[PDB]
Amino acid sequence: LLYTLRRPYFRKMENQDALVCISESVPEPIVEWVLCDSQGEESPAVVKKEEKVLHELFGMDIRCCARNELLFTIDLNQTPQTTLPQLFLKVGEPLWIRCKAVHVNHGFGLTWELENKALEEGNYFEMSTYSTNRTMIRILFAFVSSVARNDTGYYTCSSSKHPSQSALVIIVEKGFINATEDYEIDQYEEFCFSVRFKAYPQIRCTWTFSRKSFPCEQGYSISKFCNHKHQPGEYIFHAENDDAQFTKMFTLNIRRKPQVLAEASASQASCFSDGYPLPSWTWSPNCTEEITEGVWNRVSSSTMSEAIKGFLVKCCAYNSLGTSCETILLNS
Amino acid sequence: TVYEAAAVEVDVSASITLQVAPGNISCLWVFKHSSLNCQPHFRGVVSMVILKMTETQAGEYLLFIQSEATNYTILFTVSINTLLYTLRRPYFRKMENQDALVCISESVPEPIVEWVLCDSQGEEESPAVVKKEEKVLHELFGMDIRCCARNELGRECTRLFTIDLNQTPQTTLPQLFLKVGEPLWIRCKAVHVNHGFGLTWELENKLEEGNYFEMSTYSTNRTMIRILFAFVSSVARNDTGYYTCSSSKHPSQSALVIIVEKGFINATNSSEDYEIDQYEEFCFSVRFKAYPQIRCTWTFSRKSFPCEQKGLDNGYSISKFCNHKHQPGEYIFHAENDDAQFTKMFTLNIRRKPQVLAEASASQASCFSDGYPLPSWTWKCSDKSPEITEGVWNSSTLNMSCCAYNSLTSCET
Amino acid sequence: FTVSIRNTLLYTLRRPYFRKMENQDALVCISESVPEPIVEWVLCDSQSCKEESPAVVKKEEKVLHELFGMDIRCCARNELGRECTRLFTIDLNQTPQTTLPQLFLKVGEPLWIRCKAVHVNHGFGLTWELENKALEEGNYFEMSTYSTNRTMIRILFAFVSSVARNDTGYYTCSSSKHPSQSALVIIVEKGFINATNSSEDYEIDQYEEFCFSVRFKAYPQIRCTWTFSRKSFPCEQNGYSISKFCNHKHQPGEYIFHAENDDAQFTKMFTLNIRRKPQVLAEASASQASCFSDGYPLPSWTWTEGVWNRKASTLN
Amino acid sequence: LLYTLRRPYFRKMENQDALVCISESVPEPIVEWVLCDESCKEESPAVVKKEEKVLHELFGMDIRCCARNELGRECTRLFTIDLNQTPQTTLPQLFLKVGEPLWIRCKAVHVNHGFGLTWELENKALEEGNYFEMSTYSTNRTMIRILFAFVSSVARNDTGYYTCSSSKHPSQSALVIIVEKGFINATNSSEDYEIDQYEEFCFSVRFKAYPQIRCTWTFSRKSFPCEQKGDNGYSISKFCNHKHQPEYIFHAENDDAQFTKMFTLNIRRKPQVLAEASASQASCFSDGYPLPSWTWNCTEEITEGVWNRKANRKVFGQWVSSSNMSEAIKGFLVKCCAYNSLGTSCETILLNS
Amino acid sequence: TQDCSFQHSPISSDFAVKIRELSDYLLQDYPVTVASNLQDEELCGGLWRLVLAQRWMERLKTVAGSKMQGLLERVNTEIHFVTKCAFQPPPSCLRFVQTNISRLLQETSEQLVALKPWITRQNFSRCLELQCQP
Amino acid sequence: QDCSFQHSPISSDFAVKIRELSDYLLQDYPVTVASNLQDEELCGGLWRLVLAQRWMERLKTVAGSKMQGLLERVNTEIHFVTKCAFQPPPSCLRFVQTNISRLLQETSEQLVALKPWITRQNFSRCLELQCQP
Amino acid sequence: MTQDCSFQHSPISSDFAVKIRELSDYLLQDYPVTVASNLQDEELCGGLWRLVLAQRWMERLKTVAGSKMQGLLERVNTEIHFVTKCAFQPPPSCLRFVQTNISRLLQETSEQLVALKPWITRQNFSRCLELQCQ
Amino acid sequence: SSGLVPRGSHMTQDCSFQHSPISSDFAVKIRELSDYLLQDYPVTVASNLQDEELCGGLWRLVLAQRWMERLKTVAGSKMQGLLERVNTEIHFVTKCAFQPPPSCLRFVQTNISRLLQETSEQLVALKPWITRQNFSRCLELQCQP
Ligand SMILES: *[C@@H]1O[C@H](CO)[C@@H](O[C@@H]2O[C@H](CO)[C@@H](O)[C@H](O)[C@H]2NC(C)=O)[C@H](O)[C@H]1NC(C)=O
Ligand SMILES: *[C@@H]1O[C@H](CO)[C@@H](O)[C@H](O)[C@H]1NC(C)=O
């Protein structure tokens, strides 16, 4: 039931007080209405009803899904989820905002309003039903057949026994992705790459690295990737919708622990190879502490001197995580 | 009155917190013979946090509330007892008053006793199976009836042994095993249209008065289901034998009862040592007949993985392991029940590919080193230009002071 | 064995009379006639065609039980013909009739006056007043039935076994939910025919539309006949009845109207109409005191040389 | 507008076992089904009318569609053959123009239901789509059965002798005559008649004609319609209001045929001899009779002197005429007589200047 | 205080005809009910049973065919006057016994005949409370 | 005695006589219908019509003067079943109480379904009413 | 002979009291049904005769019950349907019925089944086929 | 008078609904109750309610409401819930001080199926007017005569 081909739209059946799901696709898809008992979820405890025409519009999470393998709510009775919700849509799409309110007696009303102004007669409709003891729930929907710049603005619903809650409608262009890097970690740390983005419509995302591309678990939405497998390199996140694209390059590195086991010396010249992100080198009567000044100057390795006097000499790698060394003889 | 209850177990002298329409709903904590003030937060949550669980802390902790009621009282029992924990499988006992069963599962801590009745393969794994936590079941008709006990240790379940005369003739005479003293329960269900049919039990063929009883009910369009189950309070060697049920409109189905003096695990360990074939789709197997359902574990090197202890259509249960990952070595299967233990060692020798020479040594002579299960080397002199010669030595290495022979190698001298 | 249909030649047909059957509330039609007649009860609506059966109903039974209805009349028919007597009704629902009906009957005959009133519910009564005075116990009876919605029709009949001068007078019925309607009873000693006869002679032009008329108050219903020259034609016979005759055909002469009932007779002579005409003609030349000029002209002027003979249609 | 009133036709409703009346007209007409019971339907108290399109209760004695528009009233009666009933016209003839729909209903009543009905076109079976049978119960467990035979559009092919036989009744038959255009068959001949003076005489015309003809009896200029009444088979039209007035022409015509018959009439009366007249030296009498014949002591002898009789000098205009010089030689009183089938009459004239 | 009396007679003269006409289309053994324990007071007796018979004419109309509804209603009108009075609902102690509809109609006719000479002469105020037999 | 109809005993206006009887009937009058008649594609409707016919006679005995005529008129529509020597019901035949409206409706349905076959089938085996085993 | 009634195996189910309590939960307790007022005292046939009559009521009730009420009635009908296995003769003319609450009918039916449970398979009920009056 | 308004000397009759008390799913709660009811259970309907184009349906709903309460008292555990659920759909009539029925009001016995059907139709017809009309004159139930 993924959002493939043209996403579902809504239309109120002219005959009765009920909604109809119009999802476009080539081959026609499976149109199923799903009403959840709580705010959430897809867990098999809620109610799925494949009918294309829904009559029981009262309920917590109502959403229509188009499948075939090719509803914005304001609860005055409930606490606000976010500070001033934003509803984005492309010009031409149908706006649908359902306002629900629960009161003890039926003595209460619900009203929709724009920026301090009344709503059009063919842009509103209200339903009502009874709950628990003698409770009354009311749904006052507002709808736009085809949106335009004219219809963009702050919509609010107020009740004659409830606090006025609002939401702003943003309706411009045909598709956007708004999202705001190099990293390095020690071989022991648990890390996840992250990307926060506010984008519409629902984007198709892909986390690719070297050639191996893996999909993602997508106010804003945050996509994550944790199967790094401590493998270093460029992890590129490419996300795109119908009228917009995006790509973010993430560099990754490992701990600066130096391996100095690669000792080597040609006759009359010597050096050591250091496998560490940040190497820094150091070259008889003294107990292996006297520093040899040297003649020459010093994932990747690093390299040192030319012979003057023959003896055993130690050479060290230095990094954020201390030191490591190896000793070579200056003979031939 | 309204009063709620809950069981708590004190784990070490540690500091733990106990928490449980957002509005002005009055609160009052009532500790063990002492009062306690409140601090409510919000939906709505109140808490009582204890630092270092002392012998004084342990016991009665009540919490009374008042908002949409005169009294809304809760109570919690904090237990300090120390290590005498148990989880004895559920047993059955018919309620003395009427024709209904009761589940008696013993355990420390006390467990949740839930009855589960679900259709036996229609179309376990609760897709639409019915779970009913009641400890007393009255609707003993139909489906696969099994009771489950769940405490801090885990979940042990006992299924009610059924003989459906209405169901297909099973070409394998079922065996029922149980330890002396345990209660025997064998329910016989038969479905017939018209209600005109009787059911009869016989162990000595040719049963005790207080060992049999029958119930009956109607189904779909005037159908009739009859339950004639047999029960033994405490079994003994006397009660072991072949039990059969016959109906006056159905074919006589039977099952044999085997009494076990103690818990047992019988498993015929065969082959023991094995070898991989690079592409052979193999799975290690173990067939076993054991009374208490055994707890099994497949361990190797240090990595221990549990098992799919599935039952075979012969009486015994066959456990399998396929995630060998072509890794060679000792795969040990340790399985154990309430009064018995078992362990089987499975050796494995895959490799199947020769590994060539690598060492060049001036000391005595150069070395060989071969990674193949039992190689045979020859020392050779006829290399590039031209002989069999002797090589004395103290993967399979060889001092020569060499070519491998296998079934499916090369070197430079 | 001896009841033959061959007997005396007297024969009669006395109009039907009414008599209430024993205790039960039902009426009986007693019509006398030497050859016994067919006694048929007819119940009609707002009547008047006696040969129409889609609304009007005929029931030949001699004993009628369903006395509720608009026009109830009994009819006797036997060889001589068909004489009928209508049951006098007073409908308090029917609009106030600006006429005060008059009921005539010969001393000895039985008086019958049915008062029918229809009210929404049964809550209402009916009462007869013999000129604002009490009625005899054996002279009234009340029947009742339900109609259409929860409607109630009430009948309050008044009857006299044999009438006399004593019983003549103004009868009225009042209802305890309707306006009091009345009718006067006139007793007669022998049948009568009262007619003015104030148009013995008449005069009209050659193309005028005219009908001879006769207004008369007579009882019982008279047998009328308009005879002229030899040709006799029957007639199509406010309180009085007016008989008319229009087929004059501008023919002049004596048109005599003879009307008679069982105990009375009448005859009225209606003289010529005449019209205008010139009509000239010549008579015999061999004549003393004028030759004479005939040719009947017009009643206007009925008929150079002086001294003519006497003229009387023709001028001699 | 071209106003019309085409007679009703029949069509069985495709859905159920019921008939439908299709009458064409401009303006649209009143279509009323009338079931009389008796093959006459003279009056209207026993007769039952049901003005509704499509008749379902097809059982009954005289079923005829009927009624029309402002033009008048045109009716088509459903041809019936009652096997239970007495034979009507022995061998009935059914005439209809090619293209019209043939409809023949066969009704039979039997005590029990054990009986069948069958149609046959002269010892040969009928087509499946040319028949349909219905049945219902009557009085004390009686059963009535109707097996109609129908032709959608007739042709010469369909003309012939049709017979209905029942498996408990006598086989009655009727012949079907198909016609190419309307016809009027009547014994057309120049008929002359002569009444006496007061006798009751009626002019008659027997005719077998289809469709129903519009008739008119005209004389001099005064035209009066006719009682075109129809037991023989043909229809006989009559006219009796002659008023003893002495050419009565009968003009009858249908949609595709015409007819006219000339009837001469006379009044044989006893002669009137009262018209005596005599000029000087010439004397004669005038005789008014259809058959005059003259005769010319006092009035005892016949004189055969002077004559001047009136010969046939009135061809085609021979209706009413008087008749004769009787020249003076000797003066005296003389009698002159008229003679006819009904005796004699005379008058006497003097021979003077 | 609630009174019950008839100044003008509500019983029609042709009631026996409307009952014989209904009976002609009824299956005589159709089950109806009659009170088994009515106290039977010399003034209220027939009136109480007519109230009960009246209650049956309404119940029967609901299960009757198009034309049977008219016959029932026509008999209902003959005894509908009992509803002019505020008769209290039947007491808890009133028991009913199953009887033929022919028996119910016959009894109803008998009650109207006996009630005819007294319907306008008596005060039926005490009949409003239906009473149970000792 | 053999059982077949050469000529159709079912009239064309039977549904009218049943609607007319139903118009004067109290729809909830208790009659009975067979509860365990054997499943027989040929005798089924015929057996039920025989039983419905048996009810039309029983009803006539308790019907009023005018109701007797309506019953008899519907009785004539299904009286043909008596032309056959149908054996008395077996001991195993059980009846269930139903509304007279249901009996009349079913009778109409049985006649409709039987109409096209009444003259084409031999009903000799229907004379013995059978129960479902 | 007039014998043909006995049960070798008990037709009374163990969960019958549950199906009656489930029906009772959806019924209006005051709904009018009937019980025989004149059944002869017989000690063996008594409960069986009343169950036959209660059974006759479960069929009549199903015809006027709603979609879901039909199921509850039928489910209680199955509990006492065994009475139809025997050829019980139609009720006699002398049998009189008295109106009672459907709650009373259901309660009595439950009581009859309980008392009949220990005897249903031990007795010969051939003489019960003819219902008798007192 | 039990404490009348101190501003208007000519009474203070009030009965109107600012917000519609009739729910949109009322026909469902009635069909659900009807599914467990014996359709021929005897209830009553007013036989002589005065013809009043404004109060008519409201008076009958008040009466139907009075029946829902009486029925709950004789209903089984589960039937009580179905009745109460239908009672809530028409309980709003009690928000107004409807006077007790007059002595002239006569009732006729009818099937509970008929009562439920007409209650449904009364709510449907009342739905478009419940908030637009003043029902103050409906508080006194009136008889035909
Ligand atoms: C009796 O039934 C009829 C049909 O329902 C109705 O009668 C009409 O009632 C109105 C209002 O009173 C009058 O204006 C008509 O003149 C009545 N017509 C007839 C034919 O009676 C009414 O419902 C009922 N009541 C009355 C008084 O007739
Ligand atoms: C509402 O209903 C529930 C369930 O019956 C009940 O517990 C609660 O008390 C009711 N509320 C009120 C205010 O009565």
Ligand SMILES: *[C@@H]1O[C@H](CO)[C@@H](O)[C@H](O)[C@H]1NC(C)=O
């Ligand atoms: C029953 O079992 C007990 C204990 O095993 C024994 O003493 C007794 O004899 C046995 N009896 C029978 C009948 O098996």
Ligand SMILES: *[C@@H]1O[C@H](CO)[C@@H](O)[C@H](O)[C@H]1NC(C)=O
């Ligand atoms: C299990 O094995 C033991 C040991 O040989 C034997 O005594 C016992 O009978 C076996 N039991 C079963 C049921 O295999």
Ligand SMILES: *[C@@H]1O[C@H](CO)[C@@H](O)[C@H](O)[C@H]1NC(C)=O
């Ligand atoms: C009739 O007149 C006589 C005269 O003596 C009188 O006695 C009688 O009372 C009058 N009334 C009636 C009704 O006879």
